[PDB]
Design a protein around this ligand. Sequence first.
Ligand SMILES: NC(=O)c1ccc[n+]([C@@H]2O[C@H](COP(=O)([O-])OP(=O)(O)OC[C@H]3O[C@@H](n4cnc5c(N)ncnc54)[C@H](O)[C@@H]3O)[C@@H](O)[C@H]2O)c1
Ligand SMILES: NC(=O)c1ccc[n+]([C@@H]2O[C@H](COP(=O)([O-])OP(=O)(O)OC[C@H]3O[C@@H](n4cnc5c(N)ncnc54)[C@H](O)[C@@H]3O)[C@@H](O)[C@H]2O)c1
Lengths: 308, 304, 304, 308
Amino acid sequence: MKVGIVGSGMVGSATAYALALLGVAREVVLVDLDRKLAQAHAEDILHATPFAHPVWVRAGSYGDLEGARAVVLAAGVAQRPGETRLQLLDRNAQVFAQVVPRVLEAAPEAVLLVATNPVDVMTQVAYRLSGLPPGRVVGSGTILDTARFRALLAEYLRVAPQSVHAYVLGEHGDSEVLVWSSAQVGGVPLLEFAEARALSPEDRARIDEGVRRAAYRIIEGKGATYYGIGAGLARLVRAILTDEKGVYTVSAFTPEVEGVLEVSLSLPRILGAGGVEGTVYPSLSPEEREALRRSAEILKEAAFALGF
Amino acid sequence: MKVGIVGSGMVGSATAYALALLGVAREVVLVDLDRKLAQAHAEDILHATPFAHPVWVRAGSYGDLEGARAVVLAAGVARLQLLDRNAQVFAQVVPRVLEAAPEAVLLVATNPVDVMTQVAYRLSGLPPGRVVGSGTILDTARFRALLAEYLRVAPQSVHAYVLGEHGDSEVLVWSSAQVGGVPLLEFAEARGRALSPEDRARIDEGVRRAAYRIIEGKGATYYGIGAGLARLVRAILTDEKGVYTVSAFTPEVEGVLEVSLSLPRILGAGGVEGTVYPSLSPEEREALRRSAEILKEAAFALGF
Amino acid sequence: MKVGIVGSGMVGSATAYALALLGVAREVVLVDLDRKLAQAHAEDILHATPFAHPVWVRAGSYGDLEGARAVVLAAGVARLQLLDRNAQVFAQVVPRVLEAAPEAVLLVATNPVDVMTQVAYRLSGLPPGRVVGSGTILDTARFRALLAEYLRVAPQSVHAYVLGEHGDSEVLVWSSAQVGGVPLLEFAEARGRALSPEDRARIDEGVRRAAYRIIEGKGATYYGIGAGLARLVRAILTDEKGVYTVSAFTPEVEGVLEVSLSLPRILGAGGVEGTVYPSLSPEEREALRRSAEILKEAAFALGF
Amino acid sequence: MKVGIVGSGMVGSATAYALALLGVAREVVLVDLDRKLAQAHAEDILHATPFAHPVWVRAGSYGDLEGARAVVLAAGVAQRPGETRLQLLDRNAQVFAQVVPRVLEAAPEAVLLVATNPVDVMTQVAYRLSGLPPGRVVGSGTILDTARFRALLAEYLRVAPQSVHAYVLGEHGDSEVLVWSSAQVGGVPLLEFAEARALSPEDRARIDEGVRRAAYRIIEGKGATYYGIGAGLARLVRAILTDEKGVYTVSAFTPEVEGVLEVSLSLPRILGAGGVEGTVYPSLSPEEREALRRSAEILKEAAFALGF
Ligand SMILES: NC(=O)c1ccc[n+]([C@@H]2O[C@H](COP(=O)([O-])OP(=O)(O)OC[C@H]3O[C@@H](n4cnc5c(N)ncnc54)[C@H](O)[C@@H]3O)[C@@H](O)[C@H]2O)c1
Ligand SMILES: NC(=O)c1ccc[n+]([C@@H]2O[C@H](COP(=O)([O-])OP(=O)(O)OC[C@H]3O[C@@H](n4cnc5c(N)ncnc54)[C@H](O)[C@@H]3O)[C@@H](O)[C@H]2O)c1
């Protein structure tokens, strides 16, 4: 099966690299405005293939996207020193208004995976422009933070990450919510389980920061993040390719969430061949509900300001 | 086990991402004077881990490289004076490394590998086999992949080598290339996919000019070398004893003495463990020798 | 690393084939008084190796089990007196093993696991966590697989347990089963795939009667336990610390003292490292207790 | 993709187990005269699946073989104490005359993988009965012995098996031929390479026996072999499924080999989605040519005696 990636930058190329090294798909096509950029990345990656799996990674045009089961959208522009954030956002939205129609043209059945930051905002824009049902436009959302949250909880409890059940919901950013209340280990309540075989506010704060500020720390000393999202996207693509029906905290147009209407944010969603297939609402505490409501408002606002 | 990487730029970090994605080692340590960069990198990659293999990737000082069975030297830039500068960096690194991990195998990645591997050797005071340069592994693999694509047979069944200096002095060894023990050219004709001189020229530029194409429209190469480097690390960690066209200090080659270039070599827990000299034609032996002196002179110039 | 297997019958050999196919360990040693059988087995499996992972599978004596981090006890047959006979075999094996690999974790596979794990414990003189029986791992996994199939969600998102005695006394823990942190039954209704009492009955027989169906038309079960056993071995070799419903000596449970049965447990390099008591309903707590005494009495009878 | 296996015995079931543990196919169907046998094996294997890969292993009928890309033939009868070998052979041939037509009925495009011993004989019978072109009926042949031959040479040379190029050709049995003459390491001649960085007749004899008598030793202390062929078949199935075009020493109807006509034996063959796709004749020494000629005669003879 083949997967598309429009936007052959650091995020786009890293995802292709992960897809190859992990052998998630037989064919991977990079599409970019800068034709030579996409070709150079495909060839560099192709030189890695003999050392991993037989994956056909190549650069192509929208036409070469035909038959793709999923298409990663990692196209976008870089902010100009001095312009406003809503000016930047508007410019990316223009990029999407060019890309979405082109992609669905060549691969009408493809599930759209939005990766361009801010992912929740771009996920809403991708949805409005596509003309598809909500479930077929999926943003990576908080999958990376949710995973780091479990890893951290597992490192603290001295248990395996697979046994830890924890979610980071809402906006993929500063207003994300760590669902501490219903977090579980082996089906048992985390906080409870820890208080015996605990978690002080200082421990929770240190974990909160290890999760919430990771992107910030990475951008700070590297300029951008891509390796992490590359594998995360790779995993989301495998889920679509294999029709796994696995539960991931990904961004998707949500009818109503805690009061706000028609906004895209991360919630535990069942992911398969046709996109998201159902939401799994976990138990939230008043505080958490409120934070999720807060985070939702922030995105709804950006949405309105942008015309979506 | 534990592997180290000195130089947290694109190549060094790509290598770590490969090490992590393929699940090659248990621990990966990134070392760079720009501490925040190595940490940013190690954290970007640690975000990927839950979606691949349980690899502990983190930044550290030379000291943290303690007990590493292999260390990747990917520091520097990418032009004679440049070599001297990169050479001084190695004079600074090689000691600091062997200091913390006296028994680690050194995997030179910095370009130009052949010369840089030469430098690393003399600077290490270790035996010739414990300092291995990535050399022509990507090219050999690309050579077999193109033949495989052309012949329509699986790459594992194609046996071909790219020897010598990693660059334009590369020697594609067509003379003794094989497919299932059969000479390449007759296997090709037998399959109905004969390799014309033009087909081979096409394949030659495909192998020899890849790097140039990748730099031109991308700026630098790192994805390919990251995976190749990780594969080498695996051969060292699992004492694989497999055969790779990697660069290493060679006593004599086609005429020249004490020089480093790529040849088929058995790679294990202690590094290069033996050489497998393939059959070369008159032409191929020429090139390999001319290429050998090219490196020899450059090495002499640097005082190595 | 190195894992050992005592009892080269179908289960013991299936386990080795799983260990080899999945590439769990570097070395696998098969031990059985019928030397030629263990060798035949180890050789049949060594024929598979080139087509999977580099695992050194071979036959050996207890002595060859030196340095094994885990040893699988799959000796015996498959009825009170039988227990006594199997019990005497263990009296013969447990010592001989701890003798060559004093620090290995014991993985009881011989049926009935619960009772046999009890025997192994008392006979080992090790702490309660170092003797682990396969218990209900296959049933728990089959329970989640059926719910997953029915709900149309991935198995990794389904959290359900089968506790107690591995057999007809199995307790399917429906009360606290979940899917993504949501109670199973309401998640099911929410998805439009509500679980009627008949659906659950269907699933119950699917889990509880599998073994019976497999024996009836095949004679014995070994493929499933071979892979489950290999998974446990991996958790011990990689000090995974994951959660498995395995059998182990338990100080007290729902009323009864010093007995071995299955409960969610954290498994690492030193064996069971902790217990995770899930929420049980009045009914489920009953069964688990009745089942607990069933095992307790049988254990007493054998003098354990 | 789905793979079929008619004959749910030790070889058939072991192959299914390997396919599952290695994740070679998404669906695996066991068909057997003994319906309950096949169901019990599928369910036992299904209990292993949660610990490896999501493979759907089930028992079914010939009809349930529809869409299979490859079908393993491991059906056969056990010799009756006292009957002749040609009587046993004839009885297996009767089993195949029932199976082949049924399989091609439900899965006309499937590649037939013969596993039933004697594999070369059964491979010829499978070919004659099928009505397909030669390349679509493939017997496991000497893949296991060829692999053991390389492993042994590699253990002796202290090099990796992947670098060693060696073949065991002809009949899968006592008359198989170890191609010592053109055996290579890193493209270089084995014997030559060893004599420097050697191989005495005592060393070759010890290796010959480690290869040629392995099956005998296994049958002797176990009664039958299956684990080895299970993974070997698994690998052959992966090659067909992925259209790998890899070179394997497998049995197939060969027009002419060293003089004998229309006989099935192992030769280095290119294996892909459509079966064998071309033979790779390595250099043979007079002695080897002769042994191969000898081995071919033996099989041609059995073939005639059986009516194939
Ligand atoms: N990863 C991060 O840390 C981060 C931070 C801030 C913003 N973002 C956003 O995420 C996107 C991806 O990040 P990245 O590092 O890979 O970015 P990048 O700047 O390296 O690459 C962006 C890619 O999208 C391409 N592109 C732009 N318009 C296009 C169009 N109309 N059609 C096809 N391709 C087009 C570019 O040519 C380029 O290859 C960025 O555009 C940016 O807008 C990412
Ligand atoms: N593996 C060995 O060491 C070995 C040795 C000698 C002979 N063989 C031959 O190889 C075959 C496979 O060996 P195995 O151990 O798995 O054998 P097995 O005896 O355990 O199973 C043979 C299977 O083929 C089935 N079968 C017979 N006729 C059938 C028909 N018409 N349709 C569908 N199924 C049918 C049986 O019912 C059984 O499930 C044997 O039949 C035998 O003839 C194998």
